[PDB]
Every structure is written in structure tokens, then in C-alpha cells.
């Protein structure tokens, strides 16, 4: 085991022992701790409430020196998620608060939950979603509920 592997094993154990609300995360298979799936639930009383959004987190060899990449494998409609599902957030950019020794998988996932709860507007990875959030919030909320339904298969 190298430094990345020991750290990922430790973070997985901690996430399992202390699960964040509405987040199920870990390696997809323990024979490769560099590829994780995280299921993130849209928080209750927010526009994506009860959506279940799967994301792949792909970790670099030198973790935790460098951040993972993260992409959703469900449809999304969000200012900070590219149309192809890639997540565009400051915590995942190499040195707002960017990747550093303080950061962790738990903080990545919590930051994504927060951005769902409160969509923000610096990045424009989805300009249509950025514009609808800014100017037609009621219509944004209608599409969010559709994204939720789709995430549940309903």
C-alpha cells in the first residue's frame, strides 16, 4: 500500500463509520480504491429534494496531493455541472477554497450537496441552467423536479 491507498482506505472507513446525511460513498470495488461511486440525495426542502444522484470520483496516483475528478452519471440541470456530468467546483481545482491538505472526500461531497441546496453563480458550466437560475427561478424549480423524477426512474 502506498500513501494514496492508505489515505483512501482511512477516508472510506471514516465515511462508513460516520456517514453524512443522504450520502452513500465508497470505492466501487475494494480491489481498486482509486474509483469511487457516491450517491448523493438532494436535501429535503430544497429544489432537488429526494433526488438520488450517482457520481464517479476518480482519484490521482498522488492523492491527497492532488484532487480527484468527479462526474455525475445521471442527468443533471445545474449551473456548476457540465452537460456531460463533470462537476465544476473550486474544491476540485488545484491551488474560493481550492484543493489543499485540509480537504477530503467528505468535504467534496458536502460541497456538492451544498451547491445542490443553493445553486451558485461564478462558474457557468451549464449556461442555460445559470441563466434560468438567475432569471426564471420558478422554471428552474420545475426542471429540478423533473431531474429528481428521472434520478428515481419515476
Amino acid at each position: 500500500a502506498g500513501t494514496a491507498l492508505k489515505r483512501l482506505m482511512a477516508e472510506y472507513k471514516q465515511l462508513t463509520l460516520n456517514p453524512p446525511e443522504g450520502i452513500v460513498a465508497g470505492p466501487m470495488n475494494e480491489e481498486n480504491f482509486f474509483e469511487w461511486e457516491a450517491l448523493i440525495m438532494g436535501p429535503e426542502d430544497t429544489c432537488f429534494e429526494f433526488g438520488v444522484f450517482p457520481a464517479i470520483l476518480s482519484f490521482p496516483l498522488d492523492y491527497p496531493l492532488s484532487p480527484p475528478k468527479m462526474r455525475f452519471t445521471c442527468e443533471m440541470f445545474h449551473p456548476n455541472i457540465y452537460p456531460d456530468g463533470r462537476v465544476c467546483i473550486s474544491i476540485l481545482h488545484a491551488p474560493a477554497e481550492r484543493w489543499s491538505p485540509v480537504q477530503s472526500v467528505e468535504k467534496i461531497l458536502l460541497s456538492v450537496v451544498s451547491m445542490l441546496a443553493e445553486p451558485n453563480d461564478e462558474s457557468g458550466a451549464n449556461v442555460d441552467a445559470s441563466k434560468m437560475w438567475r432569471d426564471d427561478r420558478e422554471q428552474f424549480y420545475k426542471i429540478a423536479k423533473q431531474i429528481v423524477q428521472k434520478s428515481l426512474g419515476l
Partner: peptide, 28 residues
């Protein structure tokens, strides 16, 4: 416990989150 039980537990927790969310999304 072992790897395989952690993996089955993880997959069970994923299934359980979907079941939980579908109930909440369709309730009232």
C-alpha cells in the same frame, strides 16, 4: 467485516437510499 461484506453493505445502503427517497418523493 471483510471486503465482501463491506461491499454488500455498501450496495445495500445504496438500494436503501433509493427506496427511502422514492417513498419521500411520492408521499403525502
Amino acid at each position: 467485516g471483510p471486503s465482501w461484506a463491506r461491499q454488500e453493505s455498501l450496495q445495500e445502503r445504496k438500494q436503501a437510499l433509493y427506496e427511502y427517497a422514492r417513498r419521500r418523493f411520492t408521499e403525502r
